[PDB]
Design a protein around this ligand. Structure first.
Ligand SMILES: CC(=O)SCCNC(=O)CCNC(=O)[C@H](O)C(C)(C)COP(=O)(O)OP(=O)(O)OC[C@H]1O[C@@H](n2cnc3c(N)ncnc32)[C@H](O)[C@@H]1OP(=O)(O)O
Ligand SMILES: CC(=O)SCCNC(=O)CCNC(=O)[C@H](O)C(C)(C)COP(=O)(O)OP(=O)(O)OC[C@H]1O[C@@H](n2cnc3c(N)ncnc32)[C@H](O)[C@@H]1OP(=O)(O)O
Lengths: 429, 429
């Protein structure tokens, strides 16, 4: 008997994994997986094997994997809306469960997220009184923090539930959070860019991305497709990246999923992180201001470098080859907006940047990352408010970090609390 | 020529440290400082030497140090208001500079923080519309995120400043943040607990703590003294603790100090972290509800344990002996409120808990931590709104994390981006 329920699947999954991790540790907990050096400690744990994070694994040369599923693999394996791009819903299922969902599973996440999407009065209020000079990443983060009012986990905790059932409330809270997110994000959008307009209602018959673009105001059918891809690809990028790591660190203290997501957004908003999204367009926007020669384009790049600034959208702490996310993006444009002048510029830069970056001899990875390509795509569709882009990143990212947050609590991961040292102390060591 | 300026001192300090860290790394960057195991990775980096953090170092047996200054040492060495407890101002100087400040230095931080204390309209607004069921840690965090509007660093960055001058804007932003904090915190207090009342003005002639209690509404002279100690002791606790680590992680992406502090607060609000503050009182509050026998008190404790809950305010990821912060607290009460029934209970528990905790054989550290003693002190003074306590922790903590945030940027610390692994991956490794 019975129809679909992610929670039921998970309940089945948890105890097996549980057991599986126990014996492994029983046999290998003492095994040395690495060493730490002085440079690593000074260098942002660069290279340091530090976390267990299950939803995705990033390969230095190959790029991100979802099970072991590459982007291209997802591209073909996940269910599409009807109609060529994978549903972030399916991705989510994939992340949570390790398995490739059926259309019928997928339809359920949609329905579920459609059902959950409700904004509370205090929140709408705050969003409506916000200043327009308040950054949208700021706006997003305060709204989600403020949503914690609603936390099913924070309530359950207050009540004194047994630690074993943590995962259960975390899941409810994750699903509600995912559900609401597009409402919060579109509300911000509308407030700032479409004053006097309203987000409208969620149509339980749409996929989450389509509901999103509707609330955002986009009618173009290809844009919905872009949105579907975008939100899928930005999903997750293993645990060591600032955003995901932040959620993980904050969640380990047993701060509810709302608060953990919010902190994460605070990290996504740094220029070295998600904000690169935005920094790229603005850099391209300056660029054009000041159809150019490769040589001038080169002068332009040197000038940033000499200025002690970074070239946005190039480089990676872990990747060492061109991001497949980038490649993915490029292939979308090559299909859909191959003559876009902005597209063309971005293509052009790919020819130049890495080279200039090799010339300088400082970046360990001279290739482009996801951020280098994402704005170009949005602009083309009419979404030209660049200070907004990172919100979109913010929304996708929820899918991965929340998916993981649930396993962490499920596996009983403890407080993230490493040891620090001072220079004096280290020097003496 | 000239009078006092922390920024001038720092400018002198930065380049020396700079040079000092370069050679050390030149010689020892490759030196192995440790290994990582499977258990550490599964165990929240427990035991993992992972960060360089300069302002404070925590000793497993001795407890926290400020240079190398113990709490007792600070107690005697830092300037007092007239009149026995150290000024958090002095502490701050100490943290930033490595040196013990003069009264005249100290008076400057006071003046400076008095000058900087201004709240912006959008922020007051939001605070005033907040729901009363919105947790005060929630309220605090959204307000600080929302303050980012004002970021001098975020502006400078936008503008394209050279990376070398980062520290400079970070400092301005840190000082403004410290300045405003008590305004934000007292505004929350007043809104929730003293409806229709107003925080009043900052008197440039007071120390920061005294200004705080004024805005909070406390007249008792001993309470001001408590506040001074409290805010000093909660200052900083090396870099690996959830809050400080969070600020460090988020700041490494170049998210401004406002956003980094805010995320930190999201971590301070977890039950395993700062919220223990609050959880302790509520646990003592339940306790009393249900002058008791040691034996009943023991039954009570077992019942939590059997229930899969934690005993709040006991245990530590790093300490292995009774927190000196706790001892510090106890000695204050023994001077000032030795007959308090709540005080007496807390004294009583010290006799019992650790023992029950040794009995159970799970906590690695059976001794009490800072959180076990702090609420008792506040209650006595009339501050009995427990869901508020963590805000107070929040305020102190700014002193340490911000002090460090400035050195990080000053030393050019890179993006915090460790490597993660999945179980499968690790298993295969
Ligand atoms: C969503 C995401 O976050 S993907 C990345 C988004 N961010 C960006 O696009 C920002 C631009 N890129 C960068 O700043 C970096 O490449 C990062 C942060 C992504 C990686 O940082 P790290 O792992 O420390 O990089 P790396 O090891 O290559 O650093 C070596 C040196 O090259 C510099 N370098 C690296 N990337 C760049 C870049 N894009 N432009 C200029 N210099 C760079 C580093 O800043 C550093 O300079 P330093 O020695 O004075 O400190
Ligand atoms: C401001 C500050 O954060 S100071 C600490 C504030 N927090 C608290 O007071 C919360 C209560 N204490 C705790 O939960 C813990 O002692 C912590 C989080 C502070 C340390 O966590 P860890 O370093 O992983 O602790 P430890 O290594 O002792 O854990 C061993 C086991 O003992 C348990 N244990 C530790 N402390 C406690 C406690 N106070 N009550 C009951 N059980 C405890 C751990 O939860 C764990 O149980 P598990 O094996 O089912 O996961």
């Amino acid at each position: 008997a019975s129809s679909t329920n992610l929670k039921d699947v998970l309940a089945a999954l948890i105890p097996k994994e549980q057991a599986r991790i126990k014996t492994f540790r029983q046999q290998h907990g003492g095994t040395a997986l690495g060493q730490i050096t002085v440079d690593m400690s000074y260098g942002g744990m660069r290279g340091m094997k530090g976390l267990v994070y299950e939803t995705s694994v990033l390969d230095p040369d190959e790029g991100i994997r979802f099970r072991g599923f590459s982007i291209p693999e997802c591209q073909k394996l996940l269910p599409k809306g009807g109609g060529g791009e994978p549903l972030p819903e399916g991705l989510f299922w994939l992340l949570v469960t390790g398995q490739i969902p059926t259309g019928a599973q997928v339809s359920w996440l949609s329905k579920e997220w459609a059902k959950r999407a409700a904004l509370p009065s205090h929140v709408v209020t705050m969003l409506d009184n916000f200043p327009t000079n308040l950054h949208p990443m700021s706006q997003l983060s305060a709204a989600i923090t403020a949503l914690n009012s609603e936390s099913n986990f924070a309530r359950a905790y207050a009540e004194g539930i047994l630690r074993t059932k943590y995962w259960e409330m975390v899941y409810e809270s994750a699903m509600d959070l995912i559900a609401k997110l597009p409402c919060v994000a579109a509300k911000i959008y509308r407030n700032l860019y479409r004053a006097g307009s309203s987000i409208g209602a969620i149509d339980s018959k749409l996929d989450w991305s389509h509901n999103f673009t509707n609330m955002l105001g986009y009618t173009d059918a290809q844009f919905t497709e872009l949105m579907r891809l975008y939100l899928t690809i930005h999903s997750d990028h293993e645990g060591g990246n600032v955003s995901a790591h932040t959620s993980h660190l904050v969640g380990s203290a047993l701060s509810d999923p709302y608060l953990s997501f919010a902190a994460a957004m605070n990290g996504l908003a740094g220029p070295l992180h998600g904000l690169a999204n935005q920094e790229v367009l603005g850099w391209l926007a300056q660029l054009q201001k000041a159809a150019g020669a490769d040589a001038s384009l080169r002068d332009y790049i040197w000038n940033t470098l000499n200025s002690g600034r970074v070239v946005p959208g190039y480089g990676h702490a872990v990747l060492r080859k061109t991001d497949p996310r980038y490649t993915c993006q490029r292939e979308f444009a090559l299909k859909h907006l191959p003559g876009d002048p902005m597209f063309k510029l971005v293509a052009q830069l790919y020819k130049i940047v890495p080279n200039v970056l090799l010339e300088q001899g400082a970046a360990a990875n001279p290739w482009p990352n996801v951020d280098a390509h994402s704005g170009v795509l949005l602009q083309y569709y009419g979404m030209t408010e660049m200070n907004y882009y990172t919100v979109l990143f913010g929304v996708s990212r929820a899918l991965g970090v929340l998916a993981q947050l649930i396993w962490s609590r499920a596996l009983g991961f403890p407080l993230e609390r490493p040891k620090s040292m001072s220079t004096d102390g280290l020097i003496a060591l």
